[PDB]
Amino acid sequence: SGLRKMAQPSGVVEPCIVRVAYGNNVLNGLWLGDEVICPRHVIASDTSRVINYENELSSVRLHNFSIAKNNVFLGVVSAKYKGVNLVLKVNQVNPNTPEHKFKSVRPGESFNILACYEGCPGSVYGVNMRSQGTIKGSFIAGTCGSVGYVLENGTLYFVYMHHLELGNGSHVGSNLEGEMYGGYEDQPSMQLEGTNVMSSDNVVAFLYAALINGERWFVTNTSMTLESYNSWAKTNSFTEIVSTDAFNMLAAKTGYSVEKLLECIVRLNKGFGGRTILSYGSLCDEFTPIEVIRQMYGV
Amino acid sequence: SGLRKMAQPSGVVEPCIVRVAYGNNVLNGLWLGDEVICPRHVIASDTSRVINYENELSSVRLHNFSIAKNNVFLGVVSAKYKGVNLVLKVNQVNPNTPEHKFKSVRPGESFNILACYEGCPGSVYGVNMRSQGTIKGSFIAGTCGSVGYVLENGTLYFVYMHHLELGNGSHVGSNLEGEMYGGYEDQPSMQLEGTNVMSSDNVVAFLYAALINGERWFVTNTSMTLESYNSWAKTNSFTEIVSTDAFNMLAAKTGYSVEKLLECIVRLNKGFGGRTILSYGSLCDEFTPIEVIRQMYGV
Ligand SMILES: *[C@@H](O)[C@H](C[C@@H]1CCNC1=O)NC(=O)[C@H](CC(C)C)NC(=O)OCc1ccccc1
Ligand SMILES: *[C@@H](O)[C@H](C[C@@H]1CCNC1=O)NC(=O)[C@H](CC(C)C)NC(=O)OCc1ccccc1
């Protein structure tokens, strides 16, 4: 089997992607109702030097937007900022607007990326939000405005819109309220990412996935109290676990308690000593308990 | 940027997925026009024992079929085998039939999986055909009939439908004409997968991907002739590389010849020294050259 990232199906999102162009900039927007949301730097005169967003908005030429998807062309009625996004009122309502909500993801939470190029959906893949508000994706020029979404209990949530890449290659975006994850600015200046704190919950999930896949060299009958692991995590840039509850099913199927896997984390946090788990050379925190449960058992 | 296995968007496929139930079996089918294609073992009395497909077909009663797509009830008009698939003529035309073709994938080629459960699309992810005609596909019970597809040259091709899992965990399916990849039978019987042979072309692509992403610890200026590499590969379960032409753009952009990366391959197959390469602990052959070119540079 193995453990691989998957994405939820993208069909309900694709009809919402449009191409937004202004001046020499082209990126993607999200068309819902009679509004299109896109990163505000599309109206920046020059995206390599610092941008004065007040000047850009007050001087904006609504008729100088080009917004299109296939046989649809959209006129801009009015424009405003909401955080780091432009909210553009347009003169047509999207006939394929799905029921949807907006919410923010938190560190350790997984979601899907619909990566789009110049208004055209190209690829769909799963990611996971890190403590500093970055994701490791695969964005290149033309993919700003790409959208992250999650389906929960049949509800479509929009959670991410892509804005920029940091000097170290990490990817940064906003929620659909225009709040940038991790507090970064939509400027080219160059910005630092601090140290990410690993999701302990997701690492446990990972080890359970390994066990289900038959690998067991890393496990023993020694256990380490939550209560004690949390004291360690703390000072080792690992999150601390509130309860063992999310794992009860996975413990049942495997026969191994959480407390036994906490020992593994503390022994292996430096590395595998030339060994591997699900082909990775070190601990992976990009898979949630629910992600793993669903991939191994279809729940 | 980085290297993620990506899937092409699934929207054009999702309206084609239907639930197919018969006897004690529930799986997925592909509804195109007035036809539903699904694995023929859906009519098997007992899928845990050897199946006589002639007896099962003579015993079929069309009213025991239940086929559904949301609120649509698809009545079965007639049934026949085509290879290892059932082709069911149904009493309604799919109004969302996309323009499409059928084609077979070959070892080393990438394509997308839309994994479906009880007729409901669940996940989408990219895979790559292995030398023995298998994929590592994350399939579990209830996912038979899941579809593989690729969007290439402006057309949607259906290339895979899921049938079974081998004793070693590999997954086996057919093309949509009903020929099982790798010559496997649609029986619960035990079937052997020979040795997996890695696509050398895809491994070079992968290492170029690493170079483009700034990872360079494994490379040196020592090179190895194409002829020497193929002589090595013949006895080390790697394919032989016909010529270096497909990599010219990647060679130009990185400054490294294929012949240097060939030497790299021969050195890293003995082990990584506990190191990692785009986070993998061993060589990965799941990305084609054009897949890598397009993810890193677009167009
Ligand atoms: C989309 O407009 C674009 C996506 C970047 C480009 C390369 N990989 C990405 O994620 N965003 C920008 O170009 C962005 C706009 C600023 C005004 C915030 N600037 C940016 O990301 O610069 C950093 C960078 C540019 C090009 C390659 C590598 C890093
Ligand atoms: C879909 O009907 C199912 C998908 C299998 C189930 C487990 N993982 C998959 O991909 N296919 C079968 O159950 C198939 C039935 C025909 C061969 C008659 N048999 C099969 O795959 O048996 C091997 C196996 C069964 C259950 C768990 C693990 C391996």
Author numbering:
A (entry chain A), B (entry chain B): 1 to 299
Which statements did the authors publish about this structure?
Mpro, a cysteine protease, cleaves the polyproteins at 11 conserved sites containing the Leu-Gln↓(Ser, Ala, Gly) sequence, releasing the nsps required for the viral replicase complex. Since Mpro cleavage is required for subsequent viral replication and transcription, Mpro is an attractive target for drug development against coronaviruses.
Here, we present crystal structures of FIPV Mpro-GC373/GC376 complexes, revealing the inhibitors covalently bound to Cys144 in the active site, similar to SARS-CoV-2 Mpro. GC376 being the dipeptidyl aldehyde bisulfite adduct form of the drug converts into the active-form aldehyde GC373, thus making both structures identical. In both structures, FIPV Mpro crystallized as a dimer, with each protomer being comprised of three domains, similar to other viral Mpro. The active site of FIPV Mpro contains a Cys144–His41 catalytic dyad located in a cleft between domain I and domain II. The S2 pocket that supports hydrophobic interactions of a Leu moiety is formed with His41, Ile51, and Leu164. In FIPV Mpro, Ser1 of the N-terminal finger from protomer B forms a weak H-bond (3.8 Å) with the cyclic glutamine analog nitrogen of GC373 in the active site of protomer A, however, this is not seen in SARS-CoV-2 Mpro. While structures of SARS-CoV-2 Mpro co-crystallized with GC376 solved by other groups have shown the drug binding in both R and S hemithioacetal isomer conformations, here we only see the R conformation of the drug bound to FIPV Mpro.
